[PDB]
Amino acid sequence: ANVDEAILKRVKGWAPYVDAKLGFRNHWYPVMFSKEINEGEPKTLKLLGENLLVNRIDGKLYCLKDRCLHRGVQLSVKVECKTKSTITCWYHAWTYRWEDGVLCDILTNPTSAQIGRQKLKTYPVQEAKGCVFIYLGDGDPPPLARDTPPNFLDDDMEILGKNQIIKSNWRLAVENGFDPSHIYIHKDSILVKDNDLALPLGFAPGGDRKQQTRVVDDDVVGRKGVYDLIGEHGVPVFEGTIGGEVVREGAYGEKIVANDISIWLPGVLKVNPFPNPDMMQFEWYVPIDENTHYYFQTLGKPCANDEERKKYEQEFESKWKPMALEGFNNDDIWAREAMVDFYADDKGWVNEILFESDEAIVAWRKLASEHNQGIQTQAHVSG
Amino acid sequence: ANVDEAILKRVKGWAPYVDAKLGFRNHWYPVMFSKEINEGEPKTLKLLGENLLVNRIDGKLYCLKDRCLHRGVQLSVKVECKTKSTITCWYHAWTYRWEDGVLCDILTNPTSAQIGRQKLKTYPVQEAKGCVFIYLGDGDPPPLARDTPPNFLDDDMEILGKNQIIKSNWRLAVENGFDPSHIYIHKDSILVKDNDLALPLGFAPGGDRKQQTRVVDDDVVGRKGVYDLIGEHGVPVFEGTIGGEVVREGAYGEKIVANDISIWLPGVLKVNPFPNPDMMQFEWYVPIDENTHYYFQTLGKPCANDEERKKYEQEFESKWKPMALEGFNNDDIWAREAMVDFYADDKGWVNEILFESDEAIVAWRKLASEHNQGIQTQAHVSG
Amino acid sequence: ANVDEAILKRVKGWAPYVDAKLGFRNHWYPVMFSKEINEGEPKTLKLLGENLLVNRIDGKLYCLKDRCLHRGVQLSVKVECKTKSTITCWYHAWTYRWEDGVLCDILTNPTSAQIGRQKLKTYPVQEAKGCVFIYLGDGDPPPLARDTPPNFLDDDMEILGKNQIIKSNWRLAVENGFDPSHIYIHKDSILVKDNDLALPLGFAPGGDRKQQTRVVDDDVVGRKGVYDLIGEHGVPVFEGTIGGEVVREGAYGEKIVANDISIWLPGVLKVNPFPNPDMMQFEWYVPIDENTHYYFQTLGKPCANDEERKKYEQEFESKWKPMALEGFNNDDIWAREAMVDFYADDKGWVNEILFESDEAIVAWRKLASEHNQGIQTQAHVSG
Ligand SMILES: c1ccc2c(c1)[nH]c1ccccc12
Ligand SMILES: c1ccc2c(c1)[nH]c1ccccc12
Ligand code: FES
Ligand code: FES
Ligand code: FES
Ligand SMILES: [Fe+2]
Ligand SMILES: [Fe+2]
Ligand SMILES: [Fe+2]
Numbered sequence A, B, C: 001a002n003v004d005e006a007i008l009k010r011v012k013g014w015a016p017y018v019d020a021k022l023g024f025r026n027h028w029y030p031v032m033f034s035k036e037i038n039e040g041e042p043k044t045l046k047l048l049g050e051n052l053l054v055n056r057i058d059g060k061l062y063c064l065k066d067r068c069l070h071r072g073v074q075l076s077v078k079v080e081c082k083t084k085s086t087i088t089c090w091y092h093a094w095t096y097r098w099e100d101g102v103l104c105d106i107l108t109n110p111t112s113a114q115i116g117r118q119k120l121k122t123y124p125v126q127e128a129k130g131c132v133f134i135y136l137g138d139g140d141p142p143p144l145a146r147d148t149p150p151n152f153l154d155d156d157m158e159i160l161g162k163n164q165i166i167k168s169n170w171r172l173a174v175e176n177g178f179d180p181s182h183i184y185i186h187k188d189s190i191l192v193k194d195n196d197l198a199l200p201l202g203f204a205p206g207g208d209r210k211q212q213t214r215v216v217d218d219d220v221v222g223r224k225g226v227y228d229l230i231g232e233h234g235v236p237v238f239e240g241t242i243g244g245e246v247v248r249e250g251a252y253g254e255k256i257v258a259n260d261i262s263i264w265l266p267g268v269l270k271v272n273p274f275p276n277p278d279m280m281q282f283e284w285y286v287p288i289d290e291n292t293h294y295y296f297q298t299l300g301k302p303c304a305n306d307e308e309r310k311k312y313e314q315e316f317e318s319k320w321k322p323m324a325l326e327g328f329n330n331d332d333i334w335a336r337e338a339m340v341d342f343y344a345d346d347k348g349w350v351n352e353i354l355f356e357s358d359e360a361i362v363a364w365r366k367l368a369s370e371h372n373q374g375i376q377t378q379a380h381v382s383g
């Protein structure tokens, strides 16, 4: 639907993924932190190409599409919350209920036959772990758990994150995240030197293609993901050679991190443990539009008591945010931006030359293709 | 010729209007004020996508296409007017007569077979009420009166105004103007308060459409327009209610204004009286290109003699320009801008949801669709 | 490929040239001066739409396509030359030899089946007269002499130059260069007044259109060019008239310049003598993309020894560069830019109205159509 049928015929084994330029409809996506939206202070954002309004009313989050039914203006151009449970379009004062999006009044024609006969599109919103998730899909939402990686919703898991807008397609971000050989870009990271990480340049893989990955379609809560197992067998590269001569050493720290790396629909990476043995990184690559994504980064630590919470909160601010989320992952931002041009025309998908460590990326593309809950299209954005 | 055949098939009530992206060929359009162009000071501008040169020679206005027949450069890059009667292209000195566009000389080859055998496109131009009108069309022009609203050209009607370029398609501007319910956006305007206006939130209608408006397809001089008389049987709304409660009130001033509103081909609005009970607003939405229009605003006031004229002039400058043409209509500018996205892919014309107040807009779309003197196309602009 | 057939069928005799938006494959092109690329300091540039990486290894230049075979990133985002003969992609460490582009290693997986089974595109590179030439084409190169004007490579010819990126298609630069009547734009030039150059406004052509130019396809090194001979039989315009009235004079002067003007594939102008009787000007218009070219300007002065070269360089820096290459040719830059709009949509090639001196430009469009060694396409750029 989104990509020239020419290209899609050439990528048979994962064509729906190559079509999914605007992301996957009928999933939950994190868009902002709970503390970023206050009572009666609506925030505007774009998710899967759609402009959305989010309001906190009596502490509960509500989501309306930020496009008036009348002349298609963004309500957020000038917000007019005239009662507590409504928003009034600034233009001809069509008035919508936050609760169901029902056109309930029109201040400029209070007898209009449209009143009570039209519905502004709403999306479910749920807050979990201090994160705002929107279900960008139609009808009754599934449980959040289905669209989160394992352990993110554990009772004791304390989540602290950072969010920013990155100018790459969401898929270049996923494949950067789930890439076993990409750790090459991280070899001079301050995190690797200061936190004395064990980090190879890469992996010479071992065993057959089936041993590289473990596809999880078997999860009780209905998660879809792929674990990378390139190491479980593979020989780590700590001495990078050219013509036999050794030109670069990996890092020989004592701290073992990234034992397990997994990627889950709709596009959330879990790296455990990282950046410390006492932690997990969960990061989403949320589609804003075809060119843009939220890099929604979270660090999880199990905490038992509020003193452990507050110690973690301090360590996040002083150590992990600036050293890991910025000073490790910043290289991941540059990497994603560098792939934009080769995939810009949708032709990257056919002219790329993959090697063995991309077996992981291939399984994710197949997983993504068969188990996605729908392909967002310009039809969803416009019509 | 300008819009996907898919879309035109879905707006059969008024398809030619949806096609008129660049506006209507073979009408008069205001482009600037008489005072803004001095003797032998050529000015360049763009009208219906066409770059044009205007010059005043012995007090009279002449208009050439600003595109040399030879290599297609704008002459306005470096104007060479070497005789009153000619302009010389800066590139290879092809010399055109302002009066008829004839290639009369070539300084770089006075023996050229092209001399006397080529003609640069010219457009009729004339000044009325201190406004420069160009006839952007072919053949002999109609009287200017055909393309001007009633009373604009009256012996005693003093015209004063302001012009600015706005980044919206001209039709968005037309429809904001001729919108009885849009009035809502003006409800906190400094003019409404300080000129004590009786501005309701929304002129709501009353009855069956076929008298929501009067179609003038019958005017002596060939004028084509739509009067909105939504009320006269309908109603003004001063009490804006959500779920039965007054959330907002209109303006409680003495002065009855906007009593009658009319829109005229090729796209000019008359508001009588406005912004005071003794004057009228005439405003044009002149297509520059698909994305841009001149907002050509004028205020009309009957004046007996130059004493009444000079008095209207100081009132205009001290009061009506800042409070009305800026203070009031500045709202109308960012409103048009807010409609750009929904209509940018010509999809807004299929996806819009109208209510009763828009009956007058629909009449305009039909009137415009039936009585325009041609669709400007990219063929007319280039080839 | 590049242009619609509705256009190409209407330019029979030079359709390939109208098609060559990105210029001609299988020719040498200057891109920079030798002094600009130092030992082991690689530089990026775009040529004929393609991103290229040039490096100096043991004094010799090599050129690799600046696009990894793997995920198609530019290597130059972060240059890693680990050994003298290789460059390592910063992402997954695919390692290429400069000499033949062979994938000789991958640091992230030294057992990859890809090693020794993939080639990164190379292009020959050659330095002459302090200028860097890349053979942007396939197979083995002809000698450089084929793609240089006569006398450029002469033993005693001292070359001093200047390079800058100009926002026009390369063909508008060439045509402006070789346009006999474009000298009209230089009538007010400081160089013409202060160096007392004889400069007419243009030429009334002398008789037969087939003696306005000499085509050269029978040269010792396979050079392909046209000479403008309009000055041979032409009558110079020194008194430009409008209606018989002298409105502009040419520049009287003792210095006869531009006795011979010739344009050579792939798009290099030679003007002899210029800007002084003891010097020549060679300028290339090198395609960067559809919209952009290198204006690669050089001045040749036969120098018999080293006081002569130093003396020449003094003159260049103090007078010729600012007065001639800058002062005089800045009007050529503005002239190119002024034609961009008419030719942008490819309609200019059909809509232009040519006159007698354009015989030179038509002869060049035929020469280029006949003797170019390949049309560069998006296929060569993307895949
Ligand atoms: C291998 C090893 C570590 C990581 C990875 C792949 N992908 C990542 C994304 C965020 C943080 C760490 C990692
Ligand atoms: C109703 C009432 C006043 C106005 C209107 C619609 N449209 C307008 C455009 C310009 C100035 C005033 C008005
Ligand atoms: S655009 Fe929202 S009410 Fe008209
Ligand atoms: S472009 Fe105007 S005379 Fe040549
Ligand atoms: S993109 Fe160059 S090695 Fe992967
Ligand atoms: Fe990374
Ligand atoms: Fe208005
Ligand atoms: Fe020139």
Ligand SMILES: [Mg+2]
Pocket (backbone or CB within 6 Å): C192, C193, C196, C197, C251, C252, C253, C254
């Ligand atoms: Mg002189």
